[PDB]
Amino acid sequence: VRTIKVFTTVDNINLHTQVVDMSMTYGQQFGPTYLDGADVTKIKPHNSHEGKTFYVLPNDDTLRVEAFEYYHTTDPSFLGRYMSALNHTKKWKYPQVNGLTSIKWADNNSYLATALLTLQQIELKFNPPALQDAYYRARAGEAANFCALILAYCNKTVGELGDVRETMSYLFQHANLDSCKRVLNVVCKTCGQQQTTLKGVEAVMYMGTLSYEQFKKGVQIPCTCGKQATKYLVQQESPFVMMSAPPAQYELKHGTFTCASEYTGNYQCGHYKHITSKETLYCIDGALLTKSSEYKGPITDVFYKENSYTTTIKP
Ligand SMILES: COc1cc([C@@H](C)N2CCC(C(=O)NCc3cccc(F)c3)CC2)c2ccccc2c1
Ligand SMILES: [Mg+2]
């Protein structure tokens, strides 16, 4: 009987020494086993595997504790989905486009590239240590693990089309939006006591209008009756705000926003591009980059910097 020494882990932090019989497969001795994103459950240990680290499913209780401490989820399939996604995202390209890490287009990753480009331009802190380690490694240029994790946290798969706003919501759930708070006032003769206060994801997100200044001044509620119900922002305390609206022809003025998302197409087939404001306006589409002084396009998401805003409108 011949043998090799390997390591097994669920977080790449706590490694476990393992004696492996080379006459069996990794699936027989460990369960579902992954080697750098690759599935090696059906493969027998090779001599080259000596001293290398393998991912396995949380089969015992200590591994479950380690996996939860790293990923902040109880989903047992999470590691499997993450490894399956990494098996593809390791083959993607991540070029530095205008100081940001983008993704060369493949397998309908347009929304993924836009989300990755957005996250690099907003002050945001993640709670899962896995997310934070992959975030740093993505800003450094190795975003494969980051993309696979984002796919795993959103219950999306490689090749499936995605929405940037949905992805941003899923990731904001795993973010430290604690101090973030939003206070709004509903103006209508019916409503004579509307001082709504929101904390959490809904403190930094809104779906209705793209303009943040038009949100501060006032916008009409989608009332089916048309009661001229008015909504304006009373107070905002957050490092950023994300204004979303159905894809509409919008004029992006330089210096008035941080970044924005353009969506060209219909509902079941479209393409995401990312617009950023630097010294001029830049459009990143996968690995491609364009510049201009002005921009008008089908916008759907706009991000703005914020710290503390207080309204001027007295009730
Ligand atoms: C009225 O609200 C919208 C919103 C969108 C944008 C924001 N958005 C784009 C991605 C899209 C999506 O998830 N596509 C994948 C998909 C969805 C359903 C069936 C499939 F097979 C595949 C979700 C929505 C709009 C984008 C384009 C046109 C109208 C939109 C209206
Ligand atoms: Mg591929």
UniProtKB/Swiss-Prot annotation:
Boundaries of every Ubiquitin-like domain copy: 1-56
Superkingdom in the source lineage: Viruses
Chain intervals annotated as zinc finger (C4-type): 188-225
Description of activity control: Inhibited in vitro by GRL-0617.
Result of changing residue 3 to I: In strain: Kappa/B.1.617.1
Bilayer topology: Multi-pass membrane protein
Peptidase C16 domain location: 70-315
Active site: 110 (for pl-pro activity), 271 (for pl-pro activity), 285 (for pl-pro activity)
Outcome (variant: residue 144 to D): In strain: Alpha/B.1.1.7
LRR repeat copies, ranges: 116-138
Residues bound to Zn(2+) 6: 188, 191, 223, 225
Subcellular location: Host endoplasmic reticulum membrane
Known outcome of mutating residue 91 to N: In strain: Beta/B.1.351
Effect of residue 76 to S: In strain: Omicron/BA.2.75
Subunit structure of this chain's protein: May form homohexamers. Interacts with N protein.
Stated role: Responsible for the cleavages located at the N-terminus of the replicase polyprotein. Participates together with nsp4 in the assembly of virally-induced cytoplasmic double-membrane vesicles necessary for viral replication. Antagonizes innate immune induction of type I interferon by blocking the phosphorylation, dimerization and subsequent nuclear translocation of host IRF3. Also prevents host NF-kappa-B signaling. In addition, PL-PRO possesses a deubiquitinating/deISGylating activity and processes both 'Lys-48'- and 'Lys-63'-linked polyubiquitin chains from cellular substrates.
Protein name: Papain-like protease nsp3
Organism: Severe acute respiratory syndrome coronavirus 2 (2019-nCoV)
GN (gene name): rep
Portion of the parent chain present: 1565 to 1879 of 7096
